[PDB]
Design a protein around this motif. Structure first.
Motif, mmCIF file in Angstrom:
data_model
loop_
_atom_site.group_PDB
_atom_site.id
_atom_site.type_symbol
_atom_site.label_atom_id
_atom_site.label_comp_id
_atom_site.label_asym_id
_atom_site.label_seq_id
_atom_site.Cartn_x
_atom_site.Cartn_y
_atom_site.Cartn_z
ATOM 1 N N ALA A 48 0.843 -1.181 0.000
ATOM 2 C CA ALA A 48 0.000 0.000 0.000
ATOM 3 C C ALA A 48 0.894 1.253 0.000
ATOM 4 C CB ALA A 48 -0.871 0.010 1.245
ATOM 5 N N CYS A 50 -0.156 4.886 1.013
ATOM 6 C CA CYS A 50 -1.309 5.630 1.543
ATOM 7 C C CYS A 50 -1.071 6.127 2.996
ATOM 8 C CB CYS A 50 -2.522 4.697 1.509
ATOM 9 S SG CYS A 50 -2.392 3.279 2.657
ATOM 10 N N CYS A 52 -3.755 5.464 5.322
ATOM 11 C CA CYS A 52 -4.843 4.756 5.982
ATOM 12 C C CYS A 52 -4.510 4.555 7.453
ATOM 13 C CB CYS A 52 -5.078 3.393 5.319
ATOM 14 S SG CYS A 52 -6.091 3.436 3.813
ATOM 15 N N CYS A 110 -4.711 -2.887 4.249
ATOM 16 C CA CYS A 110 -5.860 -1.971 4.032
ATOM 17 C C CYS A 110 -6.388 -2.243 2.583
ATOM 18 C CB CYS A 110 -5.413 -0.516 4.213
ATOM 19 S SG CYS A 110 -4.166 0.037 3.001
ATOM 20 N N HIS A 112 -5.705 -0.766 -0.057
ATOM 21 C CA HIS A 112 -4.635 -0.514 -1.015
ATOM 22 C C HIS A 112 -3.522 -1.580 -1.037
ATOM 23 C CE1 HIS A 112 -6.174 3.501 0.412
ATOM 24 N NE2 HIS A 112 -6.488 3.630 -0.881
HETATM 25 ZN ZN LIG Z 1 -4.491 2.302 2.548
#
Ligand SMILES: [Zn+2]
Ligand SMILES: CSc1cccc(CN2C[C@@H](C(N)=O)CCC2=O)c1
Length: 139
Positions: A48, A50, A52, A110, A112
């Protein structure tokens, strides 16, 4: 136990790294509890990219996955083990959840992709070493 397999790389907890991981070492960071070794086969895990703060982790001491809210990666004080003296571990994220030492290596994901791996926990806690900033894992 547990590892992330991405491209020609294997990501593990540094305290759980094997002789093979150390003889094929690419990068290690004692302050993060991470070690990356090279592999002969191609991995398809997606990292991922990101910020998150929600996801799901695998808890081997319960044979279950749990959804969690988790903090942003930061320097957190961690108690001693046969592996490390008491110290600040960097790039660590905490969540309220079950964990025991043998749970290290369980993946946190997550929507992603892979966010990190279990490395801490406490009395109820659980800590994850972040891997989202390791952009070179993809190339
Ligand atoms: Zn994420
Ligand atoms: C008491 S629950 C729990 C869960 C995961 C881990 C621990 C304690 N620990 C911390 C690790 C580190 N990242 O410094 C080194 C290895 C280890 O056993 C306790």
């Amino acid at each position: 136990s547990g590892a992330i397999y991405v491209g020609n790389y294997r990501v593990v907890n540094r305290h759980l790294a094997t002789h093979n991981d150390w003889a094929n070492l690419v990068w290690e960071d004692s302050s993060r509890d991470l070690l990356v070794s090279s592999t002969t086969a191609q991995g398809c895990d997606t990292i991922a990219r990101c910020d998150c703060q929600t996801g799901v982790y695998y808890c081997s001491s319960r044979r279950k996955h749990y959804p969690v809210s988790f903090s942003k990666p930061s320097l957190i004080f961690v108690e001693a083990s046969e592996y490390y003296p008491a110290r600040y571990q960097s790039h660590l994220m905490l969540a309220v959840g079950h964990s025991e030492p043998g749970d290290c290596g369980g993946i946190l994901r997550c929507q992603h992709g892979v966010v990190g791996i279990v490395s801490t926990g406490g009395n109820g806690l659980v800590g994850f070493a972040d891997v989202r900033d390791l952009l070179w894992l993809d190339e």
